[PDB]
Amino acid sequence: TENAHKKADIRRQDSRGNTVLHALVAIADNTRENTKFVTKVYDLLVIKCVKLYPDSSLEAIFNNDSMSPLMMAAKLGKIGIFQHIIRLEIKDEEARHLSRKFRDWAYGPVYSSLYDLSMLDTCGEEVSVLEILVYNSKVENRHEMLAVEPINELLRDKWQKFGAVSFYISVVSYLIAMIIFTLIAYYRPMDGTPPYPYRTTMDYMRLAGEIVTLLTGVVFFITNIKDLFMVNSLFIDGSFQLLYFIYSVLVIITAVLYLVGIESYLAVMVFALVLGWMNALYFTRGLKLTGTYSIMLQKILFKDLFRFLLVYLLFMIGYASALVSLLNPCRDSSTFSKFLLDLFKLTIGMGDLEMINSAKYPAVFIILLVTYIILTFVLLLNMLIALMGETVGQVSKESKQIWKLQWATTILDIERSFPVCMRKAFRSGEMVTVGKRRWCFRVDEVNWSHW
Amino acid sequence: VLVIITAVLYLVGIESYLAVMVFALVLGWMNALYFTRGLKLTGTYSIMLQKILFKDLFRFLLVYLLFMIGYASALVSLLNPCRDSSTFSKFLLDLFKLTIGMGDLEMINSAKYPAVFIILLVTYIILTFVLLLNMLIALMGETVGQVS
Amino acid sequence: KESKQIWKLQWATTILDIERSFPVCMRKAFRSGEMVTVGKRRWCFRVDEVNWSHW
Ligand SMILES: [Ba+2]
């Protein structure tokens, strides 16, 4: 840096557009020794950059992906260089306007620290630190990295302002979808021959409600099966997502049955109406912030019972389609409806069959039915072993990791939902004029030492 | 529960109250078998479990009975011609029998609409089978981390 | 303890049963390790390290 022939420009980038600070982040292995000296060099270079160049700061220079050294440390999953840039307080008094941690007032036992929200909550900027902590970083250390000092209180800021509001809208917006469906059911003409001529304007009004009700069940049906291939118990616990799925299944079954021409659709249509008002009993809990261990369990409960239903129904269709292929003489095209009807009744145990006479081939019907019990009894035990093989070893760690992660994940999805006008309204942090003014955040402390 | 059900049935006018009345008498002398333990002072781990066992089975009964009343009251509303006021007693009687599996029904003929009766009964199993697993996951999601 | 013991053991058990399945001709093809001429040459294996001490 200081020489007599030619000096070294600290601001110089590379072919990757990275400066001297970004290489220190890229070698910052989270160990004992390596987290020590990188904090020594990071303080040494920036003070030397200000002393040689008072106009520009070395942190301001971005990359080919427009990344600061603080923005880069969230990507590669670095902690020691991360916790030092956040806790940055410089004694040199010339590189002071870029310091991060401050001391407001020190009335005895109570210290008043002050952290800047410079890049943590970018209101009207491109991309934030906190967004890369949630949306982009795939490193395991993101559970520890959210447990740094300001972000544990920064996430509690916007949770207290947006959590109670966004939950109450979700309760009302579900009640709107129910009162629409009540007006559909009790105002049906009910002749016995569905569908109907949709020419009456006062019947055209309730016709619009089928667009609202059905497509809401369709969006919930096709996104979750895509989310399976590719349980937010904060608001509503994970038992609701399975029950609202069963509500979503019965709607699209209902929509088929009055388009086939069979007038017995009316039983299923009012059946899901009873569940939807009784699904509102999960709204009475309120809001949950303390993580239990059953939260990770109910994802696998939803993961495999949906697999348990599809392995059922494909087997019932497949074995019915199998038995039609045995019929070499003509057989009739209406036999497959009669195979599948006489096959569902055996699993329940109705005994109201039409084709299969168990008195005809008794020694074969039993040994297929006994093995059908053994197939189903093991698939039930695959549920319990997958739960018992989960609640033992590392559930003591991960259930307090994803619960912290999903609590941070949802509140930023709420933050993306508001427009740019309402974004500036409930913004945390205050303007505190320090130096020779910024949007920093007030943090309290209590300490009995340092006298 | 069986006492207040008994008190209704001889005020309705139906003389079959006598079966339920002596039924709870058999339990009450057999409930005295929990008196033989003595007194417990050493804490086990099942004590916090049996609160949630009592918390949700009472919820499991009310989510049952409101669903049985609600679906029976639903099917009366399908009847646009006159229907009769005594049909709701016959819907609810023929609806409890299906969950047990008596098959002694009076109105619902499964031979009439078989492809609809099965797919409602199959989904009725799936509704009840998940609510049973909500008991076991709430117990397994309790006896691991901080129950010690 | 044991679920992270037999899982390590069975992971090593199966890959040697796969190794017994190939003939002697295909055995020499995907052989790990390199010839590095050391001394006054052998089939050794390269291992990387990272250390900030030892200066
Ligand atoms: Ba039976």
CA distances from A357 to A341, A342, A363, A370, B101 (A): 14, 10, 12, 17, 21
A414 burial level (CB within 10 Å; 0-12, 13-18, 19+):
middle
Contacts of A368 (CB under 8 A, 6+ apart): none
Contact A87, A148 (CB under 8 A): no
Other Cβ atoms less than 10 A from the Cβ of A232: the count is 15
Contacts of A93 (CB under 8 A, 6+ apart): none
Contact A349, B101 (CB under 8 A): yes
Q: How many residues does chain A have?
A: 451
Q: How many residues does chain C have?
A: 55
The data reach a resolution, in angstroms, of 6.3
Nearest-10 crossing angle of helices B17-30, B2-12: 160
Quote the CA–CA distance of C34 and C38 in Å, as a whole number.
12
Contact B101, B110 (CB under 8 A): no
Which string of b and e fits A33-53 if b means at least 16 CB within 10 Å?
ebbeebbeebbebbbbbbeee
The single residue listed with the structure tokens 């937010």 is A232
Strand partners, A116: A440
Q: How many residues does chain B have?
A: 148
The yes-or-no reply on A/C contact (3 CB pairs or more, < 8 Å) is yes
Contact A112, A103 (CB under 8 A): yes
Which helix (H) or strand (E) covers residue A113, if one does? strand A110-116
CA distances from A129 to A101, A111, A366 (A): 17, 26, 64
Q: Phi then psi for A159, rounded to 5 degrees?
A: -75, -40
Quote the CA–CA distance of A340 and A347 in Å, as a whole number.
12
CA B101 / ligand 1 centre spacing (Å): 6
Experimentally, the structure was elucidated by X-ray
Contact at CB, B63 and A275, closer than 8 angstroms? no
Tokens of B29: 């002398």
Contacts of A234 (CB under 8 A, 6+ apart): A163, A287, A288, A289, A406, A407, A410
Other Cβ atoms less than 10 A from the Cβ of C38: the count is 8
Q: B touches which chains (3+ CB pairs under 8 A)? A: A
Q: Which residues of B touch A383 (CB under 8 A)?
A: 133
Pairs across A and B, CB distance < 8 A: 112
Quote the CA–CA distance of A447 and A443 in Å, as a whole number.
13
Dihedral angle, C-alpha A422, A426, A428, A430, nearest 10 °? 90
Quote the CA–CA distance of A441 and A120 in Å, as a whole number.
11
Q: Interface of chain A against chain C, CB under 8 Å?
A: 29, 31, 33-34, 37, 393
